[PDB]
Amino acid sequence: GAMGSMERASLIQKAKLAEQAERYEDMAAFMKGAVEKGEELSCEERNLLSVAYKNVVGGQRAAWRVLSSIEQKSNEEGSEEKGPEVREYREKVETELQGVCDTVLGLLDSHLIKEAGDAESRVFYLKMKGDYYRYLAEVATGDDKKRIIDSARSAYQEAMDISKKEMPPTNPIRLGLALNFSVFHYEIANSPEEAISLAKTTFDEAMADLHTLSEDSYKDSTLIMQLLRDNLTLWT
Template sequence: MDKSELVQKAKLAEQAERYDDMAACMKRVTEQGCELSNEERNLLSVAYKNVVGARRSSWRVISSIEQKTEGSDRKQQMAREYREKIETELREICNDVLNLLDKYLVPNASQAESKVFYLKMKGDYFRYLAEVASGDDKKSNGSFSFSLKCVEVYGSPRCIKGDTNLKG
């Protein structure tokens, strides 16, 4: 399927509220390696925001149930296992988006507006990872170091000069 067909299919998936399909189409568009148009960029963002949003909402509900479950070890175990399943899905999706950002989107962004959009998106997906991380995972999954780097860069005069390179 060529790029225009994938974009059209993503639009259809959006209308049908089938965000997993929409994300799959836009992932394939992104993996073609070309810079995305504003419309394509927004389709990608909407798709993954909805895919992740559903899992984040599910995670919050199940986490609350798990914390409130008293007495029954079996019920608590079932809630924990289900929460862990959702966490795994959420991590996979977030890592998928972060890989697209690192491999294709940020490197191919020729305009500052696009680069800022993608870097904000990157921060959002690290935040989503951090929301479900526990203990030492919060520091080891990259979200902590990326957040520190953002504070360092955007709190410095480099930001005023338009330097959006967060790698160094």
């Protein structure tokens, strides 16, 4: 606990400051410290945690993609051997990414998920668990790739089952879960038809429930519905 001596409330305050300053590594460290205080997280706090790590790992993923692309070109038929450096540095970024994912997964396993009883918290964390196993799957190539994929699938599936039982079809967490599980199907599980079906059914069921919403709730739900449509347009 590097943050063990800081007050929980101070960690949350500093996470918000780090967000405003676009210091997402700091933000993630502050929110890891907050989680490690052992108390459940409120809605706002869960989203601070998620925003922080999504931004950190998102930057790592973007860098990994650049380096992996350079590496594949160096391996084409006709390339001039540029030694081990591209592979080494891609491996360095990959190991750092895996470490961040393992950290987040560790927080979810110790002990955020087991204490999460409300649908909004439990579905949120299980979505996160699917997301970070999905990021591990994006770089996985060994004896474990299938198991990592199945861990992502299992987390997303439990989240989906709870969300369909306990939340309306326009709930933004339910929508974002389905968006991401659909991308999992398309990009990770080589199941584009499942990806398209899930996105379309999610969109249509949400459409039919929009009439129940306030103007602010409508804005949130239609935002994610547009992402579902964007993906469907990319895939069809």
